[PDB]
Ligand binder design. Structure first.
Ligand code: CL
Ligand code: CL
Ligand code: CL
Ligand code: CL
Ligand code: CL
Ligand code: CL
Ligand code: CL
Ligand code: CL
Ligand code: CL
Ligand code: CL
Ligand code: CL
Ligand code: CL
Ligand code: CL
Ligand code: CL
Ligand code: CL
Ligand code: CL
Ligand code: CL
Ligand code: CL
Ligand code: NA
Ligand code: NA
Ligand code: NA
Ligand code: NA
Ligand code: NA
Ligand code: NA
Ligand code: NA
Ligand code: NA
Ligand code: NA
Ligand code: NA
Ligand code: NA
Ligand code: NA
Ligand code: NA
Ligand code: NA
Ligand code: NA
Ligand code: NA
Ligand code: NA
Ligand code: NA
Ligand code: NA
Ligand code: NA
Ligand code: NA
Ligand code: NA
Ligand code: NA
Ligand code: NA
Ligand code: NA
Ligand code: NA
Ligand code: NA
Ligand code: NA
Ligand code: NA
Ligand code: NA
Ligand code: NA
Ligand code: NA
Ligand code: NA
Ligand code: NA
Ligand code: NA
Ligand code: NA
Lengths: 22, 22, 22, 22, 22, 22, 22, 22, 22, 22, 22, 22, 22, 22, 22, 22, 22, 22
C-alpha cells in the first residue's frame, strides 16, 4: 500500500477505536 | 483507480461512516 | 467514460445520496 | 451522440429527476 | 435562486472550467 | 451555506488543487 | 467548526504536507 | 516492519493498555 | 483540545520528527 | 532485539509490575 | 499533565536521547 | 548477559525483595 | 516525585552513567 | 564470579541475615 | 532518605568506587 | 580462599557468635 | 548511625584498607 | 564503645600491626 494511503488508513482506524466501525 | 478518483472516494466513504450508505 | 462525463456523474450521484434516485 | 446533444440530454434528464418523465 | 437554476448553473460553471467562458 | 453546496464546493476545490483555478 | 469539516480538513492538510499547498 | 510503523504501533498499543482493545 | 485531536496531533508531530515540518 | 526496543520493553514491563498486564 | 501524556512524553524523550531532538 | 542488563536486573531484583514479584 | 517516576528516573540516570547525558 | 558481583552479593547476603530471604 | 533509596544509593556508590563518578 | 574474603568471613563469623546464624 | 549502615560501613572501610579510597 | 565494635576494632588493630595503617 502506498504511503499516503497507509497514513490515511492509520488515522481512520484510530478514529474507529473511539467511534466504531460505523 | 486514478488518483483524483481515489481521493474523492476516500472523502465520500468517510462521510458515509457518519451519514450512512444512503 | 470521458472526463467531463465522469465528473458530472460524480456530482449527480452525490446529490442522489441526499435526494434519492428519483 | 454529438456533444451538443449529449449536453442538452444531460440537462433535460436532470430536470426530469425533479419534475418526472412527463 | 431557485434550486433547479442553482443546479443547472453549477454544471454549466463546471463545464466552463474546462472549456472556457465562451 | 447549505450542506449540499458545502459538499459540492469541497470536491470542486479539491479538484482545483490538482488542475488549477481554471 | 463542525466535526465532519474538521475531519475533512485534517486529511486535506495531511495530504498537503506531502504534495504542497497547490 | 518499517521503523515509523513500529513506533506508531508501540504508542497505540500503550494507549490500549489503558483504554482497551476497543 | 479534545482527546481525538490531541491524539491525532501526537502522531502527526511524531511523524514530523522523521520527515520534517513540510 | 534492537537496543531501543529492549529499553522501551524494560520500562513498559517495569510499569506492569505496578499496574498489571492490563 | 495527565498520565497517558506523561507516559508518551517519557518514551518520546527516551527515543530522543538516541536519535536527537530532530 | 550484557553489563547494563545485569545491573538493571540487580536493582529490579533488589526492589522485589521489598515489594514482591508482582 | 511520585514513585513510578522516581523509579524510571533512577534507571534512566543509571544508563546515563554508561552512555552519557546525550 | 566477577569481583563486583561477589561484592554486591556479600552485602545483599549480609542484609538478608537481618531482614530474611524475602 | 527512604530505605529503598538508601540501599540503591549504597550499591550505586559502591560501583562508582570501581568505575568512577562517570 | 582469597585474603579479603577470608577477612570478611572472619568478621561475619565473629558477629554470628553474638547474634546467631540468622 | 543505624546498625545495618554501621556494619556495611565497616566492611566497605575494611576493603578500602586494601584497595584505597578510590 | 559497644562490645561488638570494641572486638572488631581489636582485630583490625591487630592486623594493622602486621600490615600497617594502610
Ligand atoms: Cl492502520
Ligand atoms: Cl476509500
Ligand atoms: Cl460516480
Ligand atoms: Cl444524460
Ligand atoms: Cl455555481
Ligand atoms: Cl471547500
Ligand atoms: Cl487540520
Ligand atoms: Cl508494540
Ligand atoms: Cl503532540
Ligand atoms: Cl524487560
Ligand atoms: Cl519525560
Ligand atoms: Cl540479580
Ligand atoms: Cl535518580
Ligand atoms: Cl556472599
Ligand atoms: Cl551510600
Ligand atoms: Cl572465619
Ligand atoms: Cl567503620
Ligand atoms: Cl583495640
Ligand atoms: Na493501525
Ligand atoms: Na481497518
Ligand atoms: Na477509505
Ligand atoms: Na465504498
Ligand atoms: Na461516485
Ligand atoms: Na449512478
Ligand atoms: Na445523465
Ligand atoms: Na433519458
Ligand atoms: Na459553483
Ligand atoms: Na458563472
Ligand atoms: Na475545502
Ligand atoms: Na474556492
Ligand atoms: Na491538522
Ligand atoms: Na490548512
Ligand atoms: Na510494544
Ligand atoms: Na497490538
Ligand atoms: Na507530542
Ligand atoms: Na506541532
Ligand atoms: Na526486564
Ligand atoms: Na513482558
Ligand atoms: Na523523562
Ligand atoms: Na522533552
Ligand atoms: Na542479584
Ligand atoms: Na529475578
Ligand atoms: Na539516582
Ligand atoms: Na538526572
Ligand atoms: Na558471604
Ligand atoms: Na545467598
Ligand atoms: Na555508602
Ligand atoms: Na554519592
Ligand atoms: Na574464624
Ligand atoms: Na561460618
Ligand atoms: Na571501622
Ligand atoms: Na570511611
Ligand atoms: Na587493642
Ligand atoms: Na586504631
Amino acid at each position: 500500500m502506498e504511503f499516503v494511503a497507509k497514513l490515511f488508513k492509520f488515522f481512520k482506524d484510530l478514529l474507529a477505536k473511539f467511534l466504531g466501525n460505523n
